[PDB]
């Protein structure tokens, strides 16, 4: 039993279930998402909520953040992901920005630090633009300039009292990069039947590969692309038959299925043709979270934030995630696998089982 891994699996399972809701909502749009990111934010939300509100979050996540033994398990998980032995870079930081004159429950600040290894930041939301800049700047710094305008105008106002954020940054280099010379434009077939010409990378190598079947009989390829540090990998999956929609896969997705893919892999020679892409999406998490049973936190008269403060009633006004990803050749006879149709991708830290990023590429 390895506690950091146990927590990583629960967090990933929850995060993938949230993605599933998002995918089903926007079935034909590009979606880049962070399962670990949403789990981190909801974990902090557990500490600030109480009563039935906290109970709904805990039921959905499958664990309680304040159980005896969670602090070191979480502390160690952070270290497992960010350790130099990974070679590939991962940086994750949690932060809480709270209205300065808001009276906090005693022992909250120490408790928050113990679990999230970050100190509570106090701002004045009455000076709207100032507070918005402070938060946006913090995020920009912690995502190395990639996410520069997290909170748009109107996202926060004078009635805002609390902002919870997780900044996640990943920089990896392929174990075997794609030859720059092999890249050229090829046709990608969109779900609506249209066709676009996009730059596609190509590489022949012995890849860890496996083929699964959906419960209704459609086979799909899963291929693993490891990063140079050997602890992180990107899995790409897509139906074999071009007539089968990607939704057939997103509907059966789970953290366990992803583990099963990795466990069933065999190193086989394959020619891989994969589109290079640069995606940025902002997803509203309100409906996906309500669908998983977290309804109270969004309601002015039902939400319970007494674990944070008794002073005044609070409620979640907005819950969203902004993610950005760029995939290219290099960073910082074999059967053919051509991703010239919508496909799924998953970035995973294999030792812990942490699903950091995932998404559906509907149009490169």
């Amino acid at each position: 039993h390895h506690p950091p891994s146990y927590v990583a699996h629960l967090a990933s399972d929850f995060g993938v279930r949230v993605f599933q809701q998002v995918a089903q909502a926007s079935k034909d749009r590009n979606v880049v998402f962070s399962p670990y990111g949403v789990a981190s934010v909801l974990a902090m939300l557990q500490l600030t909520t109480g009563g039935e509100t906290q109970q709904q979050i805990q039921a959905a996540m499958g664990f309680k953040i304040d159980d005896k033994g969670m602090a070191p398990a979480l502390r160690h998980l952070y270290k497992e992901l960010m350790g130099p032995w990974n070679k590939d870079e991962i940086s994750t930081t949690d932060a809480i920005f709270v209205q300065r004159d808001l009276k906090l429950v005693q022992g909250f600040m120490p408790h928050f630090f113990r679990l999230f290894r970050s100190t509570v930041k106090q701002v004045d939301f009455s000076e709207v633009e100032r507070a918005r800049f402070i938060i946006n700047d913090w995020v920009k710094t912690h995502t190395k300039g990639m996410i520069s305008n997290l909170l748009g105008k109107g996202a926060v106002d004078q009635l805002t009292r609390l902002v919870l954020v997780n900044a996640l940054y990943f920089n990896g280099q392929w174990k075997t990069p794609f030859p720059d010379s092999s890249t050229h434009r090829r046709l990608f077939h969109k779900s609506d039947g249209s066709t676009v010409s996009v730059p596609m990378m190509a590489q022949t190598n012995k890849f860890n590969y496996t083929e699964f079947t959906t419960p209704d009989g459609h086979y799909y390829d899963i291929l693993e692309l490891p990063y140079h540090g050997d602890t992180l990998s990107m899995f790409i999956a897509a139906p074999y038959e071009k007539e089968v929609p990607l939704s057939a896969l997103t509907n059966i997705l789970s953290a366990q299925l992803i583990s099963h893919w990795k466990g069933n892999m065999t190193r086989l020679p394959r020619l891989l043709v994969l589109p290079k892409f640069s995606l940025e999406t902002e997803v509203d998490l309100r409906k996906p979270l309500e669908n998983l049973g977290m309804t109270d936190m969004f309601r002015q008269f039902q939400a319970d934030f007494t674990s944070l403060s008794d002073q005044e009633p609070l409620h979640v006004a907005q819950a969203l995630q902004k993610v950005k990803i760029e995939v290219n050749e290099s960073g910082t006879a074999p059967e053919e696998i051509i991703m010239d149709r919508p496909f799924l991708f998953v970035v995973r830290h294999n030792p812990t089982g942490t699903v950091l990023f995932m998404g559906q590429v509907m149009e490169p």
Partner: peptide, 5 residues
């Protein structure tokens, strides 16, 4: 790959 959330 470069990614941020």
């Amino acid at each position: 790959t470069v990614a941020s959330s």
